[PDB]
Design a protein around this ligand. Structure first.
Ligand SMILES: Nc1ncnc2c1ncn2[C@@H]1O[C@H](COP(=O)(O)OP(=O)(O)O)[C@@H](O)[C@H]1O
Ligand SMILES: Nc1ncnc2c1ncn2[C@@H]1O[C@H](COP(=O)(O)OP(=O)(O)O)[C@@H](O)[C@H]1O
Lengths: 343, 635, 635
């Protein structure tokens, strides 16, 4: 049988052109450990080969290698080319004869056996902004103070980078509202100065508890440099714990020197929510030490024991309980009850 | 013929330039080098105090103080180590690649207890990375207070200092550059000395000067605070550390509000020597399988200094929840002291770690409640391992727990199944679905549950990956109840009833086969269906229903394979149901009756729905149901 | 007062030990160093031949030959470079950290064209990693043939060689150790010289001696074969390389049977200088998103030598299919020449690469046919990018194509939708499902398709991730048709009909609400349903049906969140369907008739099925259907 010209392709077969049909010759060298892959190619080619189409005598071709050669069915997606159904081997077989491992004659390699655990991805549902989520429902003060602590951590992490997010309102903020999972809050500015953003987040905190913020209603919502003419503070409902009332009272205060920065407010919220109600927290009785910081962390889990349904609470505990300093914590545990005592 | 021998010498300028610029990746390393050298001097003077304590009369305490001064851009590192003499100063700090520590150690006796950090001889000159001029003032016994000063210009000046008496100690004074003045504040200093050199056997005390002076109201006149608070307990011998100290070590090492769950503390004493400490957390990290670029939380230490983290070949991927440290006393170390020379060593460490933590899991399984907590929180990792590695799979299998038909409400291991297996039973029947309740009432398990056999409920997507490679357990083979060729140990009159039902319904299956054409590849009389008209089942080879659904819904999937690996359905009918008998009457009466055609189409649709498959176009089924409703109501 | 200045000197022995052992990770590096130094000598002698060609009369050709000899364990690297004199030999190979190449380059004029590899001064001594004794024989003009021998013992010998005349050249003779005799054969040599130093401007010729001598039948008496076959075309200027040469370069760089798809060849000339070449393959790799530990196929070259691969910060993850090289003329390089000093540089490279390849994609989108192939094969990567990065999302959006109701059979971009949007239409209605056919006939799109509006078919799981962050496109907002609060631009009599239908069916919805209790949170009259009795819809905030199904079927999922993020259903009825009217008659007639209870239960089941939700326990629905069938047949 005549054939065409010699070219190399794929490094696993020859390519001629017979008399026109293409004889994709197959050259197997059974002296190397890759010949097992090459016998796999011997099997995976000739998918439509007839069962009785072999033309190699048994005295020259080993029946054990060619008995399951003829394929009943096989997808064979990778390689497209094909050869006719025959094989040639020297009567006294070539050097480094096939070992005849007699391995798994009746077995079929299940095509598509190779599967893979693909890369895992995360989903963050951002359905609404803060204003809509608080106009449809208003949660209880626990996770409300939790969301305020999230906002305070965010606004601290922002300005500590140098830039001043002066414009911060109910609409700029986005809420990753999990359907029944507690809503995680994120800061953004899709809608286009120190402690001013803290004033804004204090007004928004007054808003979150379901009460209209008078600094948003009548005006002066841009920044407090335009000093409001009330010169008082609006009365949040008494249902809120007086701790966060004192917090939002001091944060949006007139004086710019007394306003506690975002870090002291964040970790005083850490103390109030997570660190249980202890006389050490009050009357500034805790002597601040890193040991007492780890003791407070040891007091932090008792906020999971009763509040564990909130995935947000465990998330924040994993995220922010590590990042808190001794100095700001001392200032927080000082202020929290140098107000509350009012001595 | 004529042979002129010589001896290598070096060009000093370019050598110093190379040492400064081309060795270390990040400039923050310099702190680790100075701290380690100071600790080396500290243990040096400690060792000699054993023989004679009078040499300690200069200074009792052994500590390291850092005094950053922002006014002059000077970061001072002062200690009370052994110090240097003049000639020692010249020979050590002048001669590049010479380390007095190595000389002192080799000159020491054979059986000694010191473990000094460095021996290379170039670590000090790294200080230049962030300084223009370096000044070393040191006073050591047998010599007076001398002053070193160099600008890395190839020259250094040694002058007898006339400052204040320092006693036996050594202080290094750096003059930082404006580009690197960031290291002056305390935040980066804390972060560095906690990342590297946290486990140093001597107290490190920062000396910030944050005095407010706001007028009695002044606070923090001078702040002395320790940083290396927690001692390295893994150095201590086990059987003495109670289960408590591990708790504080866990809380300090990783910020956490709760104790650990279990601890494994072991050590290897071969030619490759290292000790290890392994913690299994009580809470699974929320972002664990979320790829945080943090592959392994295992930290690698060499002589109590940090080396490398998140080098995945340390521990296999599925064991990433494990948190702990591994410390070796000596290893081949790249010059920058940030990676090993031959990574082959990491493989042995990996094997030892995996076998030890598997033993740990095995011992943990001895308790029920603790294990339940562990499994419930980390079961996915075990199945991942079963899917990935192929040499501990045999030992990984026992760990698995499962819901069974006879289990009740609590999970149970495969060994319990094997013990409760009947004498003639020779397989382990498992059924994979999407929820326990739906699986428990499925159509496939009816005959089994009636016969008394037990079945396994696999109700999470991660299952299929595990079971498809876990094809056998302790001589008994796993068989899925939703496979075509399902057989159960029955009697012979059962076979006679089956063959007579075949010879009775052999025409009806052909009749239903010409209808439903190319929707199902075969329709035969069932042997596993009781109190259900008909159920569909996939072929023996290929994807099952739930597997195909899972990897069709899997993101980042390859479309060609999804078309390639599609299941071949096979419908099965219950010859005992009244519906089937009446349908056979109607079929044998009228070969083709439209009523039969639509009825069997609807039956196949409902069977496909219940079998776990997802219907192709549910609108047609909904329209058929709506037509049935309108017919029933008279519209 | 008295100041004794000095000057650093070095301890040679430990310095050499450090250079040998502690610098390079894998011993195979040594070949790259010798080859680069030989190429440096080659371009050295090339430069000087420009002024006078007589200095080239010694040897015309410029090549590098490797002659491994297994009989004597000698790997010889012989070239025809410039060579050295005796004094040059001593000063360069004897003095550590001195590099004659840097001296020659700086001594050269300012505007010259040479780009030599190394300037540090220690690369040569790396040969010791795999040799006990090194012998360098070199003959250079103005001097005779000299020989250098060293065993890294702190001594070197220089003797006038009396061997064969080599002409102007230099040959290095290594004596390997038995542990490293593997490098003698040709396979590892080929693999190394192709991995590193493949793009060297001079021919490298292996000299294996595989003569069979099997007796005329002898073959391969002596084998001279080149290895650096393909020239680096990126060095050449664009607008001269035709679209062909890129093909051969692609085939050679990466073994492939087919040409590339598109090529981007650009260059940056700022203070950070580098050229780049980017190929987009014609076939998507099958194992692409399969994590092969190969994150980026982009190779980083410095002066035409390999540096690093698979360092993910080079290119973002979703652009991993891009294959190509990036070559810089100068960069801060770690001493081992395997990583950069400050990784900040990689960020700028990443930004430039991403903006350039996005411009490439934009230009590719100009040709519809080509784009169609490219988008069909790599669409998943674009959506991944849209999901991950948040600064090119605006520019990545245009690239997306989609099936629409009015599209027909071919995909279409969002700009086409925006152009075909009506005047009063103010949103972009999209519907996500699992297959085009089922979505096209769904119940939600009926009223829309009737009104004439267009809708978008998203039929792959990767969609949801993209759309949930792609909340807006060019002033127009994306709205899902399977959300609760869906509104369409209608007239006022439409509103009157709607409110009168509400005032007619306001009791029936309560009646159906007390039934189906805690299965659906609300039941109201619909405004989007025509020719369908009832459909269910999820709340405005929370997962939609397909999203919940997808991330329920997603492996490695966190169970707590799956319980947390569950959709809140809302049933909607069509007040025009005859079934609804008759049901209202029956309800207003008998407050509580069971016929009505079971009927509405079944209706809700079918609606839940068609709406895309997966039924909880399909066995109950199947039993209801079987009861209906048995009733219809008279059983
Ligand atoms: N604080 C110190 N007190 C006494 N000697 C020191 C001090 N710091 C460095 N040295 C000496 O300087 C020599 C050179 O330091 P170097 O070789 O860079 O560090 P190492 O010895 O850890 O490799 C060391 O042999 C050490 O003895
Ligand atoms: N084949 C060669 N022909 C001529 N000179 C060489 C050859 N190989 C090395 N050299 C010289 O040896 C000196 C030291 O080499 P080394 O510094 O290790 O490499 P590099 O100069 O690339 O850093 C170089 O300055 C170079 O001039």
């Amino acid at each position: 049988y005549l054939i065409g010209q010699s070219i190399g392709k794929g490094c696993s077969a020859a390519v001629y052109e017979a008399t026109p049909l293409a004889i994709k010759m197959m050259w197997n060298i059974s002296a190397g450990s890759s010949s097992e892959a090459i016998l796999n190619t011997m099997s995976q080619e000739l998918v439509p080969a007839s069962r009785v189409a072999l033309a190699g005598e048994y005295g020259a071709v080993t029946y054990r290698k060619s008995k399951r050669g003829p394929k009943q069915l096989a997808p064979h997606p990778n390689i497209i080319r094909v050869l006719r159904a025959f094989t040639s081997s020297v009567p006294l077989l070539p050097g480094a004869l096939v070992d005849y491992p007699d391995v798994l004659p009746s077995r079929l390699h299940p095509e598509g056996l190779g599967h893979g655990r693909t890369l895992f991805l995360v989903m963050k549902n951002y359905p609404c902004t803060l204003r809509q989520y608080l106009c449809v429902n208003t949660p209880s003060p626990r996770l409300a103070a939790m969301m305020l602590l999230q906002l305070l951590e965010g606004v601290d992490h922002l300005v500590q980078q140098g830039i001043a997010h002066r414009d911060l309102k109910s609409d700029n903020i986005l809420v990753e509202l999990d359907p029944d999972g507690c809503p995680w809050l994120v800061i953004a500015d899709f809608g286009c100065y120190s402690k001013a953003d803290a004033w804004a987040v204090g007004a928004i905190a007054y808003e979150i508890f379901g009460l209209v913020n008078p600094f948003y209603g009548q005006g002066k919502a841009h920044l407090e440099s335009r000093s409001y003419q009330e010169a008082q503070l609006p009365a949040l409902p008494e249902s809120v714990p007086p701790d966060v009332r004192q917090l939002v009272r001091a944060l949006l205060q007139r004086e710019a020197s007394k306003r506690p920065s975002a870090r002291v407010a964040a970790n005083v919220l850490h103390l109030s929510l997570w660190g249980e109600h202890i006389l050490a927290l009050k009357n500034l009785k805790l002597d601040k030490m890193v040991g007492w910081l780890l003791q407070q962390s040891a007091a932090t889990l008792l906020a999971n024991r009763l509040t564990e349904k909130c995935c947000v609470e465990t998330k924040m505990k994993m995220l922010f309980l590590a990042n808190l300093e001794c100095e700001t914590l001392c200032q927080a545990a000082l202020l929290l009850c140098s107000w509350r005592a009012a001595l | 013929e004529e042979v002129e021998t010589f001896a290598f010498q070096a060009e000093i300028a370019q050598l110093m330039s190379l040492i400064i610029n081309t060795f270390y990746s990040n400039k923050e390393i310099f702190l680790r080098e100075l701290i380690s050298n100071s600790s080396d001097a500290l243990d040096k003077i400690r060792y000699e105090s054993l023989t004679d304590p009078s040499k300690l009369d200069s200074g009792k305490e052994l500590h390291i103080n850092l005094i950053p001064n922002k006014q002059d851009r000077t970061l001072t590192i002062v200690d009370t180590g052994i110090g240097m003499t003049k000639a020692d100063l010249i020979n050590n700090l002048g001669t590049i690649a010479k380390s007095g520590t190595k000389a002192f150690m080799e000159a020491l006796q054979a059986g000694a207890d010191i473990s000094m950090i460095g021996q290379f001889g170039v670590g000090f000159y790294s200080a230049y990375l962030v300084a223009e001029k370096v000044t070393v003032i040191t006073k050591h016994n047998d010599d007076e207070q001398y002053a070193w000063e160099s600008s890395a210009g190839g020259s250094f000046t040694v002058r007898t200092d006339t400052g204040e008496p320092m006693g036996r100690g050594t202080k290094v004074i750096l003059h930082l550059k404006e580009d690197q003045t960031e290291y002056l504040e305390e935040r980066r200093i804390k972060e560095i000395v906690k990342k590297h050199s946290q486990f140093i056997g001597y107290p490190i005390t920062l000396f910030v000067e944050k005095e407010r002076d706001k007028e009695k109201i002044k606070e923090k006149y001078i702040d002395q605070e320790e940083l290396n608070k927690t001692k390295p307990i893994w150095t201590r011998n086990p059987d003495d550390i109670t289960n408590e100290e591990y708790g504080e070590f866990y809380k300090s090492l990783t910020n956490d509000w709760e104790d650990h769950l279990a601890v494994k503390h072991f050590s290897v004493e071969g030619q490759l020597e290292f000790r290890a400490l392994l913690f299994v957390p009580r809470r699974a990290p929320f972002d664990l399988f979320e790829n945080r670029k943090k592959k392994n939380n295992i930290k690698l230490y060499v002589r109590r200094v940090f080396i490398m983290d998140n080098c995945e070949e340390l521990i296999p991927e599925y064991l990433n929840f494990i948190r702990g440290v591994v410390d070796s006393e000596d290893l081949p170390l790249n010059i920058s002291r940030e990676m090993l020379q031959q990574s082959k060593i990491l493989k042995v460490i990996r094997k030892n770690l995996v076998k030890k933590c598997l033993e740990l899991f095995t011992e943990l399984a001895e308790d029920k409640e603790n294990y339940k907590k562990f499994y419930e929180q980390f079961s996915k990792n075990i199945k991942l391992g079963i899917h990935e590695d192929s040499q501990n799979r045999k030992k990984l299998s026992e760990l698995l727990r499962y819901y069974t038909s006879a289990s009740g409400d609590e999970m149970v291991s495969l060994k319990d199944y094997c013990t409760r297996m009947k004498e003639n039973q020779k397989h382990i029947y498992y059924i994979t679905g999407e929820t326990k309740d739906q699986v428990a009432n499925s159509a496939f398990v009816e005959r089994l549950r009636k016969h008394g056999l037990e079945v396994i409920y696999m109700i999470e997507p991660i299952d299929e990956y595990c079971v498809q490679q876990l094809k056998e357990f302790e001589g008994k083979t796993l068989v899925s109840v939703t496979k075509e060729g399902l057989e159960l140990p029955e009697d012979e009159e059962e076979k006679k009833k089956q063959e007579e039902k075949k010879t009775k319904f052999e025409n009806l299956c052909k009749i239903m086969k010409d209808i439903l054409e190319k929707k199902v590849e075969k329709v035969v009389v069932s042997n596993r269906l009781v109190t259900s008209p008909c159920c569909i089942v996939t072929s023996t080879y290929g994807w099952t229903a739930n597997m195909e659904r899972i990897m069709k819904a899997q993101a980042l999937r390859d479309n060609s394979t999804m078309g390639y690996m599609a299941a071949k359905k096979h419908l099965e009918i219950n010859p005992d149901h009244s519906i089937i008998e009446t349908l056979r009457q109607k079929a044998e009466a009228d070969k083709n009756d439209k009523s039969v055609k639509d009825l069997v189409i609807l039956l196949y649709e409902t069977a496909l729905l219940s079998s776990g498959f997802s219907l192709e176009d549910p609108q047609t089924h909904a329209n058929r149901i709506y037509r049935m409703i309108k017919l029933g109501l008279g519209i």
